[PDB]
């Protein structure tokens, strides 16, 4: 679903989908060449 | 005959070895895509 998300770091819109992408275990937020957020670890849980 | 058929090989040979002869084409995509890349870049900068 298209919602607002705000998880501590930034307020916009988009779709949370699942993916296999692989984050390393002390990253959080990552970004694209253009400068906008396409992933979000979830915070109480482990989650791409 | 012999003349007109090697002059055609000569051309797959030159593609491949040469990447360069294509680059006009190329300066069309690159040109296009650092344009889009750079009005994108705009959005995170404060402007004062």
Redesign the interface.
Known sequence: KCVNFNFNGLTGTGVLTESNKKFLPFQQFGRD????TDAVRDPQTLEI | ANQFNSAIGKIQDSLSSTASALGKLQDVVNQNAQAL?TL??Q??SNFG
Not at chain 1, 33 to 36: G, P, R, W
């Open positions: 060449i253009a400068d906008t | 890349n994108v870049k959005l995170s």
